[PDB]
Each structure stands twice: as structure tokens, then as C-alpha cells.
Design an enzyme around this catalytic site. Structure first.
Site, mmCIF file in Angstrom:
data_model
loop_
_atom_site.group_PDB
_atom_site.id
_atom_site.type_symbol
_atom_site.label_atom_id
_atom_site.label_comp_id
_atom_site.label_asym_id
_atom_site.label_seq_id
_atom_site.Cartn_x
_atom_site.Cartn_y
_atom_site.Cartn_z
ATOM 1 C CG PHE A 39 4.929 -2.591 -8.659
ATOM 2 C CD1 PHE A 39 4.989 -2.050 -7.137
ATOM 3 C CD2 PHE A 39 6.075 -2.384 -9.513
ATOM 4 C CE1 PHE A 39 6.133 -1.303 -6.810
ATOM 5 C CE2 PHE A 39 7.144 -1.476 -9.008
ATOM 6 C CZ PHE A 39 7.200 -0.871 -7.599
ATOM 7 C CB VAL A 97 2.855 -6.535 -5.280
ATOM 8 C CG1 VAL A 97 2.784 -7.538 -6.335
ATOM 9 C CG2 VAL A 97 4.240 -5.777 -5.220
ATOM 10 C CB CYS A 98 -2.150 -6.385 -8.234
ATOM 11 S SG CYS A 98 -3.440 -7.112 -8.502
ATOM 12 C CB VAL A 99 -3.254 -10.356 -3.992
ATOM 13 C CG1 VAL A 99 -4.766 -9.826 -4.342
ATOM 14 C CG2 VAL A 99 -3.299 -11.674 -3.660
ATOM 15 C CB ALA A 111 1.202 -11.296 -6.553
#
EC number: 2.8.1.-
Lengths: 101, 130, 132, 132, 130, 101
Positions: free
Chosen positions: B39, B77-79, B82
Site C-alpha cells: 500500500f 504499508v509504506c512508512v 504512513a
């Protein structure tokens, strides 16, 4: 050997037009989500879509077609209607998938 | 074959997440492997456990979580994306000084390199966006 | 080993796609794959020179494009038809330098304007296409 | 007192704009203002008949449009040029009934197809325009 | 004059929130009244306190909060859209069984009627979206 | 007496074209965000924009223009460049604001 995916309306975005310009002989194009409207007979883009059938294999996602109120009979003859399983087979049959957002 | 799926939009706002879900489910039922579901952009918003969508319609987050449980999917999920949008797990909360977390336990926050890594390992990269 | 294409088609600032897409290219550099970045349609606007964002309250990320050569990106393409449709010429775009200490190559600009047939060819040579 | 226009221009399902826009119309009903709902461009697709969403895993919200008359919405307009560009006719759209117990009016369908000049006129008569 | 501002997109993903902010600031400096700033659709995501954006760029949420503090703005987030996307305050957490909240204290979650109400009270309704 | 706002690229979306079709004599149109590209001289839409100047007052947001790399001199003559304060004045001078997303 590329499967191009188009999910935006041809009346709303330029995605479909750009795809049809760069897709080469033998390539496949799948219309899903709002891209489905481009597969309908009688629209202002029917001419350009029909012309594309001359060198490309066009597919339309049945689930999105039906959700928007259209039966398979409303599609431009030549565009194959597929379901999600068919969508998956297209990505594996073709060598690469290219999304036109 | 092995698939790498990328989702760039948030839940409900765009059909992207739903389309990706239906594609994943269909691919998984065919025996294909989904190496990773990544994501990015607003797509990171598909990982929050704080949604309470209408009961007469699909629950995108829980549905993804159920699929991940059944097929043991690696949902990442991309940090960076995010942090910009407010998706926080325990580590992030501590490092960023937040007093709460909102990530769904089935998802993991990691580097963008996990996306490129999946593109290298998978046979096909299927992107869902706007 | 694989050939990766980064397809940029959206204008900068109106959406975050240009900036976050650029982030992926920088990250992908460390994987040493064969990479090419293509700017098509409104994506060509991502390379305009002289961007000044003080008036919109956002950080100007344009300088990052000029560092792409430092991240081993040698192949950067721009669709000529897209430039024309927008009344732009290569003179309106930033230059992206490329230097390799080992091979001694030192180019002031590697941004290449190409025709539609070449674009289609590059697409057909890719093993994976990142879209944003 | 005021004239409110709800401008619908996006196709349903691809985005949430159609559904959440419809939510505003229902809510606005209780304020008893002068309201009109216009479907233009891809917005005309929001009114197609026979939508079946079981294949995409989403709830079919189309029935709600047919209840608009129950929420005092008497003025529902559809751009004729948009319909033509999409090869659609009024026969492809759902009917929206309207009944008022006090005035005895009982209409099977109040959806009205209008020309471009009328659309512009309706826009000029609005005090506020809700866009989605 | 009095303005009613509507923001339909999430922070960073679309320039909408930034454009709305610059418009609001300019209007406020001119002496105009902003009756209410209403966040709808993905716009509700402009109200989370869990963002940690890069330090060398603007912090959209905090910036809106600072503007609200200085001009005493009524920033409202649609409850329906918030429930679908994961924006939760104390009341919602209790009612929806969540173990955490993420709303920024300067924003309030309320009904969609607050938007229509503002359109009625304000002289102009300016919508920012995609 | 309507101020129409267009924030999407004329090459990307159909927003600008629809706006120019329905805007009436005396109305104002403001291009901001990605809509700014439509105000540039030399594009494929210059013809239709220039024609619009014949009955509409066109404005472009300078901050967005500059952010995208263009100076005021790059704009089609006739389109007035305004800043955010000017944007605000346009909404109050006109009777209603209509956003074309």
C-alpha cells in the site's frame, strides 16, 4: 505482449486515448472500473475504440459493466467480456501489465 | 505465477482497493501466489483499524485482513507515506511521540524497498490506482 | 536483471504522485536493476525548469530530479508529442547530469526526447511498470 | 430561501463522490431550501437503470435516487448533450416519482432532460453550488 | 462577507487542502468571516493528529490547527465520512468500540447538516476538491 | 455573475472544456492548481481558451503558475494573473462560486 489496464472514463480522463496511441499490434487492453464506459456501443468514442480492435485485443470487466447498468449485449462487438478470473488470466497470458491511471 | 500488488488509493474514496481485493481473491483461488500486497500513497489508509463503515456494505479493512489470514498474505504499508498520513503502529508511536496507534494488526509498516523487492521477485506487478 | 519502467503521467503539485513516484526511483536505485524513467502526457510538466513554490506554501522538490544521475539512472525519456501538445521544447526542461567514475563518462544532460514509436518500444521491453 | 444546486459530474462506483453526494441531498432536505440536482457529463451515468453490483462486492445504492421525490426534491435535471455523447436516451435512466399529499400532485417521473442553455440558466439562478 | 469552505480530499494526496488553507488565510487577513470549514469525503483525513510529515515541508494538520487557534475557526469533520475512513474522537471510540482515538483536538466531528447549515448562513460556498 | 473555478489540467480532465461550454457572457473563470496549464500560450487548447476570452473574464492563480515553472509572460494575453488575495476578491465580486472538479 503487454496487457494495458484502463480504469478511467474516456469522457473524464485522457487515459484511454493515450493507451490506444502507444499500445502495439498484438497487445491486449482491459477496461475496468470507470474504463468500462469506453466499451459501450453508441458513445462518442466508439469510432476510435472500433479502430483499435483492428490491431489490439480488447477486453472489458463484466462485473464493472453490470454494476454500472449494462449487459454484455451493450458492448461494441469484438470486445470480450471477462470476469475477475479472466482478468487474472490476462495478466499471466501477457508478459507484462501496464496500468494507465 | 507470483504477483506483486500495489494499491495507491484510500478505501471507499476510489474503487482501487476493491478492485485489487477482487483481483487478489481471484488469483489466490486459482493457486497463484501473491508475494506481497503493498500500500502506497493514500493506499496506506487501507490499514487502519479505526473504521466503522455501514453494516450493509463491505468492510474493506476487515475483508483484506480476512483474506490475509486465509492465505497468509504479506500486507505492507509504506512508512514514509504512513507518516505523512497518520498510520501508526507501536514503533512509530514511540519514535514519533504519539499517544495512540491505529494500524490493523494484520498489516505491517515497512520501507518502500519492500515494493521494489516484490517487483523483482514476482512474475507480474499489478498496480491499482486512480 | 529485470527491466523496470517508471511511468510518470501526472503534473506536479496538484497531486502527490510526482513526488512520491520520485521517491520510489531513488529507493529502487540500490537494487541495481535496469531502470528507465518515462515522462508522458502531463508527466512532462514534472521536468519544467524554474519552479518556485514559495507562493503555494509547499517545498520545491524539483531539485531532486536533477540528482537522478547520482542514483545510477541513465535512461530518462520524455515524449516529444506530449511536449508539443503543451507548447514546450526541451529548452523548457531541466538538465539531468550523469557521471560514472569508472567509465569516465560525464554528461551534462541525459534527458532524451523521443518519438511515439520509441516510447511503445520501451514499454515492450519492460518487465515491470510502476504507475502512479 | 436560498437556491441550492447539487452538481453531479462523476460516474458511480469508480469513486465515492456519487454516493456521498447523494447523502448530502438527503440531509439537505430537512432545511427546506429551494433545491435542484443536475447530472452533467459522467454524472448522467449515476442515473442508469438496472445496476447490479453483486459482481463487484459493493452495495447497490441506486435505489436511493428513486426516493429523492420523498425528500421533497422536485427538480432533477439531466444534460441532453451528455446523454447523447454517451449514446444514452432518457429510456436508459431510472424514473424518480414525486407526490405531495397537500397539492395532490402525483408524478411517475420528474427527471427532466434539458439543453445546454437551460443548464447555464439553472447555474445562474443558484445561490450556492455543491460540487463533489 | 461570510464564507463556508468545503474540503473534499485528504492531506498531501491532493492540493485541495493546501489551496483551501491559502484561500482561508487570505480571506481572514482581509477581514472576511469564515463561518465554518467543513471536511467531507477523504477530506476528513485532514483532522488526524497522528501525522509526522517531513520537517522540511508544511505540516497540513498543525497548520490548519494554528489558523483555527488564531482566528477561532469552526472546523467540522463529517461523522459519516469519518466512520468510513477511521477518524475517531472520544465519543466515537466508545460508541464504536475502538481502543484509541486519532482526531486532532482542534477539530470536531459532527453531522453533514452542519455543511448545509453553513451554506445557508454564509454568503459564499467555496469547494475545494479533485 | 458566477465565478467558475477549474483546478484540473485541460489535457488530463474534461473540466475546463465543460466549464467553457456552460459559462455565460460576463462570467469569470479562475484557473488554479493544475488548471493553470490551460492559461499557457502555445498549448493545444490555446485556441479554445482565446475564444473564451471573447465573452468571459479569465484569471489564473499566479502562485500555482510560478510553482509549476511559468512566469506571467507565458500566459495567453488577456488572462489576468491574480494571487490568493485576488482569488478571494473574485469570490466576493461575483455572486456565486461554482467549482468544476
Amino acid at each position: 505482449s503487454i496487457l494495458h489496464t484502463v480504469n478511467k472514463s474516456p469522457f473524464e480522463r485522457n487515459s484511454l486515448e493515450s493507451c490506444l496511441k502507444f499500445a502495439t499490434e498484438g497487445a491486449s487492453v482491459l477496461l475496468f472500473e470507470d474504463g468500462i464506459y469506453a466499451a459501450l456501443a453508441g458513445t462518442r468514442v466508439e469510432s476510435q475504440v472500433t479502430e483499435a480492435l483492428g490491431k489490439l485485443k480488447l477486453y472489458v470487466l463484466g462485473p464493472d459493466l453490470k454494476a454500472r447498468g449494462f449487459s454484455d449485449e451493450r458492448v461494441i462487438p469484438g470486445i470480450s467480456v471477462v470476469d475477475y478470473a479472466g482478468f487474472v488470466d490476462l495478466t499471466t497470458e501477457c508478459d507484462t501489465v501496464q496500468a494507465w491511471l | 505465477m507470483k504477483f506483486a500488488l500495489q494499491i495507491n488509493e484510500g478505501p471507499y474514496q476510489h474503487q482501487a482497493s476493491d478492485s485489487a481485493y477482487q483481483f487478489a481473491k481471484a488469483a489466490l483461488e486459482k493457486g497463484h501466489e501473491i508475494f506481497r500486497v503493498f500500500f502506497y500513497h493514500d493506499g496506506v489508509n487501507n490499514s487502519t483499524r479505526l473504521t466503522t463503515p455501514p453494516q450493509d456494505d463491505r468492510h474493506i479493512v476487515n475483508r483484506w485482513a480476512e483474506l490475509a489470514e486465509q492465505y497468509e498474505l504479506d500486507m505492507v504499508v509504506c512508512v514514509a507515506a504512513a507518516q505523512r498520513r497518520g498510520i501508526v503502529d507501536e514503533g512509530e508511536a514511540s519514535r514519533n511521540g504519539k499517544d495512540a496507534t491505529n494500524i490493523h494488526p494484520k498489516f505491517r509498516i515497512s520501507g518502500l524497498g519492500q515494493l521494489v523487492e516484490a517487483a523483482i521477485q514476482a512474475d507480474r506487478l499489478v498496480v491499482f490506482g486512480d | 536483471v529485470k527491466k523496470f519502467m517508471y511511468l510518470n503521467r501526472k503534473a506536479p503539485y496538484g497531486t502527490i504522485y510526482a513526488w512520491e513516484a520520485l521517491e520510489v526511483v531513488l529507493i529502487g536505485a540500490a537494487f541495481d536493476q535496469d531502470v528507465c524513467v518515462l515522462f508522458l502526457d502531463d508527466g512532462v510538466y514534472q521536468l519544467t525548469r524554474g519552479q518556485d513554490t514559495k507562493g503555494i506554501g509547499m517545498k520545491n522538490f524539483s531539485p531532486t530530479y536533477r540528482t537522478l544521475g547520482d542514483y545510477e539512472v541513465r535512461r530518462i525519456y520524455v515524449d516529444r508529442d506530449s511536449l508539443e501538445a503543451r507548447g514546450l521544447t526541451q529548452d523548457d526542461l531541466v538538465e539531468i547530469a550523469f557521471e560514472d567514475m569508472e567509465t569516465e563518462e560525464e554528461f551534462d544532460n541525459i534527458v532524451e526526447v523521443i518519438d511515439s514509436a520509441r516510447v511503445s518500444e520501451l514499454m515492450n521491453e519492460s518487465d515491470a511498470v510502476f504507475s502512479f
